[PDB]
Amino acid sequence: SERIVINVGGTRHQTYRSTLRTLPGTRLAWLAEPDAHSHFDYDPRADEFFFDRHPGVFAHILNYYRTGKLHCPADVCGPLYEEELAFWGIDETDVEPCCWMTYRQHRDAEEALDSRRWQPRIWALFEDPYSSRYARYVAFASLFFILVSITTFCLETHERFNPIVYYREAETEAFLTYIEGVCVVWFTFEFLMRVIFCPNKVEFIKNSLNIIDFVAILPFYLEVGLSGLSSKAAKDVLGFLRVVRFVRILRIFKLTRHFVGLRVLGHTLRASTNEFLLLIIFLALGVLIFATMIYYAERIGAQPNDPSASEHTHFKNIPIGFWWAVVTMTTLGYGDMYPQTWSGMLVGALCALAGVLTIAMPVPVIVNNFGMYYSLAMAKQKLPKKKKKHIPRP
Amino acid sequence: SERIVINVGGTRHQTYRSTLRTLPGTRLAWLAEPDAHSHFDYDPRADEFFFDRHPGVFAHILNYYRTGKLHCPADVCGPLYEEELAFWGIDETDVEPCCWMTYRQHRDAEEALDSRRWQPRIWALFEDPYSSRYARYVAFASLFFILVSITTFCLETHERFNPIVYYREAETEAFLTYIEGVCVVWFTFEFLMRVIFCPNKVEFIKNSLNIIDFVAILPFYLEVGLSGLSSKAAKDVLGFLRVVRFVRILRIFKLTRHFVGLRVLGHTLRASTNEFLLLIIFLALGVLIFATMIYYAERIGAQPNDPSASEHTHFKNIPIGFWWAVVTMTTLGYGDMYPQTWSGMLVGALCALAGVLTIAMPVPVIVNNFGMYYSLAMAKQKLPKKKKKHIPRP
Amino acid sequence: SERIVINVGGTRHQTYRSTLRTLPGTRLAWLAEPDAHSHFDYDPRADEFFFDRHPGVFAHILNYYRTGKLHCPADVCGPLYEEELAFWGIDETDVEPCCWMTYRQHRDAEEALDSRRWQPRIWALFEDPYSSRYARYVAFASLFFILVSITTFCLETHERFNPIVYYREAETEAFLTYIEGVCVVWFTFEFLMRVIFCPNKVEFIKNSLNIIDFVAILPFYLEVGLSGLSSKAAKDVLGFLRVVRFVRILRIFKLTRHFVGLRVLGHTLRASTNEFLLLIIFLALGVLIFATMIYYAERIGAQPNDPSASEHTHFKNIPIGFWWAVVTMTTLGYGDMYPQTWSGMLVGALCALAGVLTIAMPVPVIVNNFGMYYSLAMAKQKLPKKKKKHIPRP
Amino acid sequence: SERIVINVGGTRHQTYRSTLRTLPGTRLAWLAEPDAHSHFDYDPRADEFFFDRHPGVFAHILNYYRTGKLHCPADVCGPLYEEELAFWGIDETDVEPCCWMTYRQHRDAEEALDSRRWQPRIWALFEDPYSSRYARYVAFASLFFILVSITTFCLETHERFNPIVYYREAETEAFLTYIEGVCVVWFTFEFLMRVIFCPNKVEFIKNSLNIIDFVAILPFYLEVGLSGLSSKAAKDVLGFLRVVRFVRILRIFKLTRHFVGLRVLGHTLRASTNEFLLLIIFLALGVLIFATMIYYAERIGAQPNDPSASEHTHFKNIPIGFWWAVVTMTTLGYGDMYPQTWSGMLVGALCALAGVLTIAMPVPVIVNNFGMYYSLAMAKQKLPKKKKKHIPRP
Ligand SMILES: CC(C)CCC[C@@H](C)[C@H]1CC[C@H]2[C@@H]3CC=C4C[C@@H](O)CC[C@]4(C)[C@H]3CC[C@]12C
Ligand SMILES: CC(C)CCC[C@@H](C)[C@H]1CC[C@H]2[C@@H]3CC=C4C[C@@H](O)CC[C@]4(C)[C@H]3CC[C@]12C
Ligand SMILES: CC(C)CCC[C@@H](C)[C@H]1CC[C@H]2[C@@H]3CC=C4C[C@@H](O)CC[C@]4(C)[C@H]3CC[C@]12C
Ligand SMILES: CC(C)CCC[C@@H](C)[C@H]1CC[C@H]2[C@@H]3CC=C4C[C@@H](O)CC[C@]4(C)[C@H]3CC[C@]12C
Ligand SMILES: [K+]
Ligand SMILES: [K+]
Ligand SMILES: [K+]
Ligand SMILES: [K+]
Ligand SMILES: [Zn+2]
Ligand SMILES: [Zn+2]
Ligand SMILES: [Zn+2]
Ligand SMILES: [Zn+2]
């Protein structure tokens, strides 16, 4: 009477019936019911109910009934305790905040890391680099052409290839367009080939890489076909396309999607927006305050000879002090503008220290997130897959 | 005789009666008393006293009796062990320093994070941003006006808006005062409205935000009403108020009290004064020593032609060397003053290394405190509240 | 029937026969066999099988059968659990990724840290510094000569020792060759002595230190013997050898192989190639993007008077912007080139912040690896060796 | 026969007699002896030996017998396991390196943190600041005078107080000597007073603070008494003492010995010599290598017009490159010398990255040591002392 013994894997557990009756609906509440012999396994010889579960972790679950607080043991992994409490019918959202972050720690990372007879032949040839042997060579050729185009784009801006000769203006070397045309013909061939053999055309269009590639390809054709009449409009649009040429520097992301580190970095960035917002707010407040202080401190040494007190200082006003504050708070220190008054040097020292602290605040959080994600992702490489040795249904 | 058995949740614990008698007053001391059968639950069939507690944590409490030292197990949370030792009557202030910081770790953070029929309608409309729908719009309007006033304050100091025309002096653009007046009429309206419908007027006055707002509002009225006679006094007070204009840059803190990160930062700053004092002392000692050394090192290359040996160096004396030491110890390095002698370069290298070390000493402590506070505070957002499932009194 | 009890070191474990039959081939599968009494120790009085193993760690192994997932307890060391699961016949490559990195953590470090009657007398005299008393003195003499040669090599490039006097050219001081000859005779003696008394001559040649030493010695002889005819060839080869003189600065690695810290650093570098690759890729992407942005941002303030818009800026093109991006992303900030336009300062601030983040990403991983390796290596110094007290075969 | 049962605090432990016989001399070896009934507590009714010890930690000690390896559980503190293994007679120096650093972790810190009827009245008045009420005021007066002397010493070097008037030379202001004399009379009084009432005079002399104070006091008397004849010797010694004046800046350490942070820093420095040596060696190697590389890289752009190729570069030689390497490897970047050739910029980038890595290697070790020491020392402030409630001898 009022005493019940629980046998969990050969380990006896003894408690009062009243304590088991605290939480209704749960399996233990069913066990506290007097007519539960036909429900659970029970032997009248020992008068103890039998289970088959981990005996070292049932203690915390029972202690939740005994006291009222739910905690997770630190000697077992999170998923193991989660499964164990799921079996007994305890809702996992009742654990105390003292031991919540470690509990829901691996699950978030795990879920974030996972968040026409020839059409299969053609589509797999261009998409998966290692689905075959030829796809590797195609990917390497694309890498070569991308690097060539980027190199040409960087060279076009140099003064050696832009002689001065409209009266004078300046012209780029002719072959710097021929190389670009050689790259463009291949890029057009590849884009046209893949847009035909892609299932779910609308999904293909919705992708950002495809539109980036199309936008990169278009200006060459526009320029080569728009060298005729309408002088004003032609000259405006040619300058606009000359500016927009930069979009072909973004094609490098097309072939770097297969690198593990970049995917880990992308997940880290997507999972750490709040820290970026916090860092931006901290920097804004610090920059504003220190710019105001450094502006007002440098006016002490104002010479009593000029109508404008800003002749002996680099800090003519506050907005120009924003730049100095940003440079100084990150320990960069270009040196183009620095305090020159005994009162300004104290503010400079304070600015340096405050910048160090306010930068060191959230960066460790971001770095820890990246480290955890990277470790988890790199663990997958060591263990490819197994053959599910544990056959269920004993 | 001299042998007793303790049953803690189905787990047998056996010890001599003498060991239980070490600590008087405690529940175990009562248990060691021969006439305790009427006090505690006891069955003559098994001759063991019965309890209902966690069996895996009673071992450490009993070991405290057995040896004399009190330690906390590392497989359970701090609060769980604290409650368990509280039940048995053991004072928590007796644990050894080897395992004290982890024990009293969550409690400090938890306590620090928590450290006229229309008057309710009016007061809640201005104070709580999200107590209703209109309060959100009022807060947004206040944000707009605050940003406008700050922008005008920053613009007033620029040279483009201060043409030179008393003989010449300089004047600010007229509309830069009209915008400020438009902001200040709203600010006056809001401040006057809230000061009427605030319960506990003295508490309202004691708040720093209200006095900041009043001090920000006052100078505009003083200037607009004090443009008359008494030329000397008027000209002095106008300059004084022109200086004090900066106080309206502090109203940004009025609406940032609702951001979680800033509250966490405030708690971190309030809980880490000792580390700031330590950092300041370290920096002072380093700056003094290295300024002296760099002053004395640069005099080796003194040219035997000038009465003052400080003509070939930036280090004319020690106080000017304070600035170089501060700049160099934080890896900032403006470059306005640097050593130029073979003996000074060694001191410069030593200064850089010592600065790195003496900065890296306490900053990790401060950062760890901030990280723990931020994690605990952010855990609250995920779990709003529950319905107290565990009904007491079994 | 369908119920079995396992006795592991005095601790009863109870489970159904069906659960033990999940994994075939394992020892428990043999135990589930009905005719296992003649195989394992078993007493009909208690009807329980007896073992001699740790009872606190068998629970997780049995739980692997009960649920299907394999985890490692956090209350015991990795090697202990590894040995325990090896005894029971469980393959260690089945543990979940949630608890894999900590499991295979010490093993990798441990394996990485371990990855003619006079010939023994002569060879040990030069190789092992502390195999005797004389070897210490020989090593010290070699250190002295190496330092002298390095000092002379550094001095040869100074202008004080290179007076101008072929019509003018320049000549080095004579004694700067005599000191080198004095060092070279000893180095030749040592190298000749060790190459004779080295077993496995081909292995000796395969070593990098020996070829480094030979390459360092050779140019002195070549120069001292090649000051004759064939003016053109002699003058070319003399300049080439003057350039190659630098190889004698690498002999310092010959005597630093015995320092523990350098060996730990070598192991850390060899074990962290992926992080270096990741860091290089991140830096390349950041430098490219920010160089492009800073080039395009500075052209806003182009003066409408010059054909080339790059007259008011340091950023004449993109390749020169690579250098500024590299300098700025590491918070170095020489200051030789900095933005001077309101649009360029925003890009500069973004570049500084992005550089800080992208550097702080993988460096903690590398540092953690070094710290673990160094701690493990320094643990060996405290404990030299023992006398294997535990005699096997009880 | 061949089977024994051990009762450790109510927990049954069962093992073969042969396993207990592995380690001789230990208490378990005595227990394996057949004639041990008269030695240990034993009851023939249960045929089990009884002990009074922690049952959860005896498992690892027994497992040491079972397998041969000794490990420490991670669920208990180091001192608890140390005491437990000390009781059973196991030498603590046999634990494996896999779990040695955490075991011997608290002990090292704990031991390092602890490594004439009026004579008691007088001596305590000057030494202990808070042994009384007057000692506090005496310490404050000493602080005031020390600060005044340091301020005067710093002011003496400024140009404002050194007018030019031997023909011209320069003289310091007269009162800058009177203030020093006022400080010196008090310092002499204090030093003379304490040197009389100090027990163990030789120990008093052996202290560094006393000799520092005496050396600081002496030059004032020497100067004030040595303004007479022997012009050459007087003028030499006066300059020497003018140089040695700096020793009075070190008296600040006299009163900072009572600050907790400085004592913690001293212990950290004394306990981390190896890391400093490692850091110095790393920096030396890096500086040498990168100085050589940057010297040889800048000679590519040598103009074919000058005899000395070092006219277009800051890197005239290697020793001057040492300074640039030191400045660049710490991300300081003064900017007084920087590469100006496309080949030198690559070396500069490599130097910056290598410097960051080689600095970030051992600094975390040093910082972790400081943090542990500081936490342990600061824990003492919270818990002053107790009254040893646990009375031994049950
Ligand atoms: C020690 C810490 C708090 C830093 C010290 C900051 C001091 C030096 C700064 C901060 C605010 C500054 C003052 C703000 C406003 C003005 C008005 C101007 O017309 C003259 C200088 C004067 C009066 C400044 C003097 C210098 C000042 C007092
Ligand atoms: C190697 C470490 C300890 C750094 C070395 C510091 C050396 C180079 C510095 C520190 C103190 C310096 C000395 C202090 C005082 C003077 C008096 C002055 O009239 C001539 C230079 C002279 C004699 C300095 C020479 C340079 C010096 C010895
Ligand atoms: C706020 C964050 C996103 C940074 C802001 C970057 C801005 C200021 C930069 C990035 C790209 C830049 C533009 C890129 C291209 C050109 C073409 C050039 O002929 C005129 C300037 C112009 C139009 C630039 C103006 C400044 C610009 C818009
Ligand atoms: C990519 C990594 C390895 C950095 C690249 C370092 C390169 C650019 C450096 C390192 C060593 C340098 C060479 C070393 C020696 C000399 C001899 C000199 O009379 C002409 C330049 C020359 C031939 C240097 C050219 C630049 C050089 C090759
Ligand atoms: K700098
Ligand atoms: K810098
Ligand atoms: K600089
Ligand atoms: K820096
Ligand atoms: Zn908890
Ligand atoms: Zn402890
Ligand atoms: Zn796990
Ligand atoms: Zn271990």
mmCIF file of N, CA, C and O in Angstrom, chain C residues 225-266:
data_model
loop_
_atom_site.group_PDB
_atom_site.id
_atom_site.type_symbol
_atom_site.label_atom_id
_atom_site.label_comp_id
_atom_site.label_asym_id
_atom_site.label_seq_id
_atom_site.Cartn_x
_atom_site.Cartn_y
_atom_site.Cartn_z
ATOM 1 N N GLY C 225 87.594 28.488 -55.988
ATOM 2 C CA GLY C 225 88.250 27.831 -57.095
ATOM 3 C C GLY C 225 87.866 28.329 -58.467
ATOM 4 O O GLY C 225 88.419 27.848 -59.461
ATOM 5 N N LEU C 226 86.938 29.279 -58.562
ATOM 6 C CA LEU C 226 86.451 29.727 -59.859
ATOM 7 C C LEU C 226 86.677 31.220 -60.054
ATOM 8 O O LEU C 226 85.770 31.941 -60.480
ATOM 9 N N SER C 227 87.879 31.696 -59.743
ATOM 10 C CA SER C 227 88.247 33.095 -59.923
ATOM 11 C C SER C 227 89.300 33.250 -61.015
ATOM 12 O O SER C 227 90.239 34.039 -60.892
ATOM 13 N N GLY C 228 89.154 32.494 -62.101
ATOM 14 C CA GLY C 228 90.128 32.516 -63.173
ATOM 15 C C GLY C 228 89.602 33.042 -64.493
ATOM 16 O O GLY C 228 89.093 34.164 -64.567
ATOM 17 N N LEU C 229 89.717 32.228 -65.543
ATOM 18 C CA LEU C 229 89.381 32.642 -66.900
ATOM 19 C C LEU C 229 87.887 32.521 -67.177
ATOM 20 O O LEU C 229 87.094 32.332 -66.250
ATOM 21 N N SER C 230 87.502 32.639 -68.452
ATOM 22 C CA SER C 230 86.105 32.579 -68.887
ATOM 23 C C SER C 230 85.282 33.663 -68.186
ATOM 24 O O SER C 230 84.419 33.396 -67.349
ATOM 25 N N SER C 231 85.588 34.906 -68.565
ATOM 26 C CA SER C 231 85.093 36.063 -67.822
ATOM 27 C C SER C 231 83.570 36.099 -67.766
ATOM 28 O O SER C 231 82.992 36.330 -66.700
ATOM 29 N N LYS C 232 82.900 35.873 -68.898
ATOM 30 C CA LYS C 232 81.441 35.954 -68.920
ATOM 31 C C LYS C 232 80.809 34.886 -68.035
ATOM 32 O O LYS C 232 79.973 35.187 -67.170
ATOM 33 N N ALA C 233 81.202 33.626 -68.237
ATOM 34 C CA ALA C 233 80.641 32.538 -67.444
ATOM 35 C C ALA C 233 80.991 32.697 -65.972
ATOM 36 O O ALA C 233 80.149 32.461 -65.097
ATOM 37 N N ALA C 234 82.232 33.091 -65.679
ATOM 38 C CA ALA C 234 82.638 33.279 -64.292
ATOM 39 C C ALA C 234 81.815 34.372 -63.627
ATOM 40 O O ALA C 234 81.335 34.204 -62.502
ATOM 41 N N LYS C 235 81.625 35.498 -64.316
ATOM 42 C CA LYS C 235 80.851 36.592 -63.745
ATOM 43 C C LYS C 235 79.385 36.229 -63.561
ATOM 44 O O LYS C 235 78.759 36.709 -62.611
ATOM 45 N N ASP C 236 78.821 35.403 -64.444
ATOM 46 C CA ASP C 236 77.439 34.974 -64.245
ATOM 47 C C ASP C 236 77.317 34.016 -63.061
ATOM 48 O O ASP C 236 76.443 34.183 -62.198
ATOM 49 N N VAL C 237 78.193 33.011 -63.001
ATOM 50 C CA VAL C 237 78.076 32.015 -61.942
ATOM 51 C C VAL C 237 78.406 32.620 -60.586
ATOM 52 O O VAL C 237 77.842 32.207 -59.569
ATOM 53 N N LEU C 238 79.315 33.597 -60.534
ATOM 54 C CA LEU C 238 79.617 34.232 -59.259
ATOM 55 C C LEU C 238 78.406 34.978 -58.718
ATOM 56 O O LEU C 238 78.118 34.910 -57.519
ATOM 57 N N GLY C 239 77.677 35.681 -59.584
ATOM 58 C CA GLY C 239 76.440 36.306 -59.147
ATOM 59 C C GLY C 239 75.405 35.289 -58.707
ATOM 60 O O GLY C 239 74.708 35.485 -57.705
ATOM 61 N N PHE C 240 75.299 34.180 -59.442
ATOM 62 C CA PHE C 240 74.341 33.146 -59.061
ATOM 63 C C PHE C 240 74.657 32.577 -57.681
ATOM 64 O O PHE C 240 73.756 32.384 -56.855
ATOM 65 N N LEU C 241 75.934 32.309 -57.407
ATOM 66 C CA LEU C 241 76.311 31.774 -56.104
ATOM 67 C C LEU C 241 76.162 32.826 -55.013
ATOM 68 O O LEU C 241 75.803 32.504 -53.873
ATOM 69 N N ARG C 242 76.433 34.089 -55.342
ATOM 70 C CA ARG C 242 76.178 35.170 -54.400
ATOM 71 C C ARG C 242 74.713 35.196 -53.998
ATOM 72 O O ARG C 242 74.380 35.462 -52.838
ATOM 73 N N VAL C 243 73.821 34.919 -54.948
ATOM 74 C CA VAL C 243 72.402 34.828 -54.625
ATOM 75 C C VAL C 243 72.126 33.603 -53.761
ATOM 76 O O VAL C 243 71.429 33.685 -52.743
ATOM 77 N N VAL C 244 72.677 32.450 -54.148
ATOM 78 C CA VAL C 244 72.373 31.199 -53.457
ATOM 79 C C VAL C 244 73.005 31.108 -52.077
ATOM 80 O O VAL C 244 72.726 30.155 -51.340
ATOM 81 N N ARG C 245 73.862 32.067 -51.711
ATOM 82 C CA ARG C 245 74.431 32.097 -50.365
ATOM 83 C C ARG C 245 73.379 31.948 -49.273
ATOM 84 O O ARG C 245 73.697 31.491 -48.171
ATOM 85 N N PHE C 246 72.131 32.327 -49.550
ATOM 86 C CA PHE C 246 71.104 32.341 -48.514
ATOM 87 C C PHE C 246 70.845 30.964 -47.924
ATOM 88 O O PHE C 246 70.277 30.871 -46.833
ATOM 89 N N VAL C 247 71.231 29.896 -48.621
ATOM 90 C CA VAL C 247 70.893 28.556 -48.164
ATOM 91 C C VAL C 247 71.594 28.209 -46.860
ATOM 92 O O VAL C 247 71.188 27.263 -46.177
ATOM 93 N N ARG C 248 72.628 28.955 -46.482
ATOM 94 C CA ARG C 248 73.313 28.693 -45.226
ATOM 95 C C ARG C 248 72.610 29.324 -44.038
ATOM 96 O O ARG C 248 73.079 29.170 -42.908
ATOM 97 N N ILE C 249 71.507 30.035 -44.267
ATOM 98 C CA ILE C 249 70.662 30.484 -43.166
ATOM 99 C C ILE C 249 69.736 29.386 -42.679
ATOM 100 O O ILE C 249 69.138 29.521 -41.606
ATOM 101 N N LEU C 250 69.606 28.299 -43.436
ATOM 102 C CA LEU C 250 68.721 27.201 -43.083
ATOM 103 C C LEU C 250 69.388 26.151 -42.213
ATOM 104 O O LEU C 250 68.707 25.230 -41.754
ATOM 105 N N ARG C 251 70.694 26.256 -41.976
ATOM 106 C CA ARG C 251 71.353 25.293 -41.108
ATOM 107 C C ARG C 251 70.928 25.429 -39.656
ATOM 108 O O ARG C 251 71.253 24.552 -38.852
ATOM 109 N N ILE C 252 70.218 26.499 -39.302
ATOM 110 C CA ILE C 252 69.753 26.644 -37.930
ATOM 111 C C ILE C 252 68.749 25.554 -37.584
ATOM 112 O O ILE C 252 68.624 25.164 -36.418
ATOM 113 N N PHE C 253 68.028 25.032 -38.577
ATOM 114 C CA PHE C 253 67.101 23.937 -38.329
ATOM 115 C C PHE C 253 67.807 22.639 -37.980
ATOM 116 O O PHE C 253 67.155 21.712 -37.492
ATOM 117 N N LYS C 254 69.113 22.546 -38.226
ATOM 118 C CA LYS C 254 69.835 21.320 -37.920
ATOM 119 C C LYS C 254 69.867 21.052 -36.421
ATOM 120 O O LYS C 254 69.708 19.905 -35.989
ATOM 121 N N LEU C 255 70.071 22.088 -35.614
ATOM 122 C CA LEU C 255 70.205 21.924 -34.174
ATOM 123 C C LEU C 255 68.934 22.246 -33.404
ATOM 124 O O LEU C 255 68.917 22.092 -32.181
ATOM 125 N N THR C 256 67.875 22.692 -34.073
ATOM 126 C CA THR C 256 66.617 22.979 -33.402
ATOM 127 C C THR C 256 65.635 21.823 -33.487
ATOM 128 O O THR C 256 64.495 21.957 -33.038
ATOM 129 N N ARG C 257 66.047 20.695 -34.058
ATOM 130 C CA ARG C 257 65.189 19.522 -34.089
ATOM 131 C C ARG C 257 65.011 18.893 -32.718
ATOM 132 O O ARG C 257 64.095 18.083 -32.542
ATOM 133 N N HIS C 258 65.858 19.235 -31.751
ATOM 134 C CA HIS C 258 65.771 18.672 -30.414
ATOM 135 C C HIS C 258 64.875 19.476 -29.485
ATOM 136 O O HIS C 258 64.605 19.027 -28.368
ATOM 137 N N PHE C 259 64.414 20.644 -29.915
ATOM 138 C CA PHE C 259 63.514 21.442 -29.095
ATOM 139 C C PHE C 259 62.096 20.901 -29.215
ATOM 140 O O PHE C 259 61.617 20.633 -30.321
ATOM 141 N N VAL C 260 61.423 20.734 -28.077
ATOM 142 C CA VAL C 260 60.111 20.096 -28.079
ATOM 143 C C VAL C 260 59.084 20.961 -28.798
ATOM 144 O O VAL C 260 58.254 20.456 -29.567
ATOM 145 N N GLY C 261 59.121 22.271 -28.560
ATOM 146 C CA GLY C 261 58.116 23.145 -29.140
ATOM 147 C C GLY C 261 58.113 23.119 -30.655
ATOM 148 O O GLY C 261 57.055 23.155 -31.282
ATOM 149 N N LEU C 262 59.295 23.048 -31.263
ATOM 150 C CA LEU C 262 59.358 23.026 -32.719
ATOM 151 C C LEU C 262 58.821 21.719 -33.283
ATOM 152 O O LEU C 262 58.170 21.715 -34.332
ATOM 153 N N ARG C 263 59.072 20.597 -32.608
ATOM 154 C CA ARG C 263 58.487 19.340 -33.061
ATOM 155 C C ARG C 263 56.969 19.373 -32.951
ATOM 156 O O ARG C 263 56.259 18.890 -33.845
ATOM 157 N N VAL C 264 56.453 19.945 -31.863
ATOM 158 C CA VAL C 264 55.006 20.077 -31.720
ATOM 159 C C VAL C 264 54.440 20.953 -32.829
ATOM 160 O O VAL C 264 53.386 20.652 -33.403
ATOM 161 N N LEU C 265 55.127 22.051 -33.146
ATOM 162 C CA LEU C 265 54.677 22.924 -34.223
ATOM 163 C C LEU C 265 54.683 22.199 -35.561
ATOM 164 O O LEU C 265 53.771 22.378 -36.375
ATOM 165 N N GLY C 266 55.709 21.390 -35.813
ATOM 166 C CA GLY C 266 55.744 20.628 -37.048
ATOM 167 C C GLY C 266 54.583 19.660 -37.162
ATOM 168 O O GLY C 266 53.949 19.556 -38.215
#
